[PDB]
Design a protein around this ligand. Structure first.
Ligand code: ATP
Ligand code: ATP
Ligand code: ADP
Lengths: 533, 125
């Protein structure tokens, strides 16, 4: 019913052109050959397939087009969580209601009926395997059995086709993949440069049709600027550009009584696209420039040699992880005394890598969580990281993730075991990863056998000389000439062990008085904090 | 034949005598478990310092046996599980192993299945 090489273009789906060929070659070879030879051989057709991948990557379009191209009746869409009810023996009824028409048509027309396709969604919701993990989601296992009894069993159905869709391929019941049942898996991953270009081509044909779009805008620049968008973020970008351009044009024309010549024109230009891209759309699988300003609040100032050493070592590690074989997983750990400024340096090192996927997992967003929820969140972040060619994950505080208190001692063992397992699991073939730690108590970590898993260590020291303090003050720029002179005469005493954060706090506290008494207050504050190595 | 090529990532090069001794001992154990009649159940434990290459050698010994049933139970596929889930998984694997006439099972990183930590000590009973 379809031409030998088929056709998939300018009909919607544009990014996935090899997938159709792959699936048709692997599964649907029986429905294209002349029926006489198929009946002569005496073979049965495949009775379903499974699709899995990241959300919003164009799965429903594929199912609808596959159904359309086979000359099948209207698909009977359905959702996963919708088929669930607390009353005993009611979900089975919902599962059973779906096949009535197929049964009736088979009963009437015999062996000449058409093809009916049922499209499920979030099929992993009904499965007696999610109960293994922490929680209670037994979903009254019986449900699944009923479904199987309809795909096969004593009563045979020969005019159906089941297309399953899922996001978590590791929660699918194992009994649902043997031969004779859903038995063809496939992956629909993120698009690439060509896919993004094609999607932008398809989604913008309307404006070009009526010459409304300006000649300034390109499509290659927007195709290369967007790194890990899938499909919906591109549609969102187009829509946001439309809306922003419209609002700006109407407001500007109201502000200035422009002639009808430009009033009729409603060009969107390129500025609207860039503004919407940089302010409107926030990708889920890409870099997030907003969170960096939340950690590096006062920038980075060079008060000594160690900063350059740390930055250079970070660059070397990034280069090693980027282009290298035989070692696709690399780890590192930053250790130092409290208030030394470790989080900011880690964030800077991650930012300078220019990787497409950068994330930060910190306990600031896990207040009141039970340990199981923390394990879930960590696993989710790492699972998301595993779906990109180059990634980078930062773990903010390893001591707070364990709930360590010196009395006892006390802590949670589940999180420790999860971290130890996750630190030594390479990604699927052909993909890289990088992990950066941070902590202030190295001895406890060494004592817990966790330092045997990391690959390197770096040291972040404090300010340990007077001239360094003078240089830091000079860079900050808060004291005058005579003030600096007075400070210099009195701080040559040596044995000066302070942290950058504490230094900032002391300066801020001291600057709350009149200019006369600032110096003595600052010196008193420094002396009360003047411990020794 | 996909797990074995996933656990032996860079082959097995012979840098000294011990490799030959280990492989020969494994072969002798396999032949014993195959040809005996009054000793159907056999066990062996491989131990050594960290980062020494125990899993690769165990996988190679299992693969070079030609048994019709072979399976590996590693802890890296049970992240976030509870004690009961681990018990059920292990029992299921062994129950499946019991239905063949010749089988081999690999248990990997025994110290990570019990959740051992030197402080305490703490673990799962
Ligand atoms: N070279 C630098 N190194 C570190 N911090 C710097 C540097 N230059 C400026 N800072 C400032 O230091 C502060 C970092 O303090 P922050 O509280 O992030 O430290 P931390 O090591 O993460 O602390 P904690 O041990 O509480 O987690 C930021 O204000 C940053 O602007
Ligand atoms: N003769 C050999 N013995 C062991 N490993 C070898 C040998 N020849 C090469 N290798 C390489 O050694 C690596 C195996 O190390 P592996 O990570 O399995 O160590 P391990 O002892 O299982 O570690 P762990 O105790 O951390 O679980 C693989 O790269 C393998 O290619
Ligand atoms: N080439 C394309 N690939 C993927 N999605 C596309 C493509 N062109 C358009 N889209 C849009 O992306 C969305 C993908 O289908 P949708 O049902 O929203 O997501 P999913 O089924 O992946 O959860 C739809 O809005 C669809 O119109």
């Amino acid at each position: 019913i379809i031409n030998p090489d088929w056709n998939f273009e300018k009909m919607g789906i544009g990014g996935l052109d090899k997938e159709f060929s792959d699936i048709f070659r692997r599964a649907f070879a029986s429905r294209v050959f002349p029926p006489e030879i198929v009946e002569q051989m005496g073979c049965k057709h495949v009775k379903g397939i499974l699709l899995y991948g990241p959300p919003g990557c164009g799965k429903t379009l594929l199912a609808r087009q596959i159904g359309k191209m086979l000359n099948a009746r209207e698909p009977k869409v359905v959702n996963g969580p919708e088929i669930l009810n607390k009353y005993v023996g009611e979900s089975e009824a919902n599962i059973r209601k779906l096949f009535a028409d197929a049964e009736e048509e088979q009963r009437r027309l015999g062996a000449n009926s058409g093809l009916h396709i049922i499209i499920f969604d979030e099929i992993d919701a009904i499965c007696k395997q999610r109960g293994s993990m922490a929680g209670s989601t037994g979903v009254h296992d019986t449900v699944v059995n009923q479904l199987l009894s309809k795909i096969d069993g004593v009563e045979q159905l020969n005019n159906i086709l089941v297309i399953g869709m899922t996001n978590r391929p590791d929660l699918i019941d194992e009994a649902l993949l043997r031969p004779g049942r859903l038995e063809v898996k496939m992956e629909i991953g993120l698009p690439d440069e060509k896919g993004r270009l094609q999607i932008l081509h398809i989604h913008t044909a309307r404006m070009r049709g009526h010459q409304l779009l300006s000649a300034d805008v390109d499509i290659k620049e927007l195709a290369v600027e967007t790194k890990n968008f899938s499909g919906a973020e591109l549609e969102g970008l187009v829509r946001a550009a439309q809306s922003t351009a419209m609002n700006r044009h109407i407001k500007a024309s109201t502000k200035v009584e422009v002639d009808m010549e430009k009033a009729e024109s409603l060009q969107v230009t390129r500025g609207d696209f860039l503004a919407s891209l940089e302010n409107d759309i926030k990708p889920a699988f890409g870099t997030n420039q907003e969170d960096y300003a939340s950690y590096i609040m006062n920038g980075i100032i060079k008060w000594g040699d160690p900063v350059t050493r740390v930055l250079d070592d970070g660059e070397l590690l990034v280069q090693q992880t980027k282009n290298s074989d035989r070692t696709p997983l690399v780890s590192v750990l930053l250790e130092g005394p409290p208030h030394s400024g470790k989080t900011a340096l880690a964030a800077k090192i991650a930012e300078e890598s220019n990787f497409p996927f950068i994330k930060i997992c910190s306990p600031d967003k896990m207040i009141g969580f039970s340990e199981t929820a923390k394990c879930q969140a960590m696993k989710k972040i790492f699972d998301d990281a595993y779906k990109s060619q180059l990634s980078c994950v930062v773990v903010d505080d390893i001591e707070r993730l364990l709930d360590y208190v010196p009395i006892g001692p006390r802590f949670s063992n589940l999180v420790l075991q999860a971290l130890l397992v996750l630190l030594k699991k390479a990604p699927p073939q052909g993909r890289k990863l990088l992990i950066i730690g941070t902590t202030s108590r190295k001895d406890v970590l060494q004592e817990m056998e966790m330092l045997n898993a990391f690959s390197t260590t770096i040291h972040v020291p404090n300010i340990a000389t007077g001239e360094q303090l003078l240089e830091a003050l000079e860079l900050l720029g808060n004291f005058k000439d005579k003030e600096r002179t007075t400070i210099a005469q009195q701080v040559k005493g040596k044995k000066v062990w302070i942290g950058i954060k504490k230094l900032l706090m002391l300066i801020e506290m001291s600057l709350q008085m009149d200019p006369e008494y600032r110096v003595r207050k600052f010196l008193a504050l420094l002396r009360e904090e003047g411990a020794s190595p």
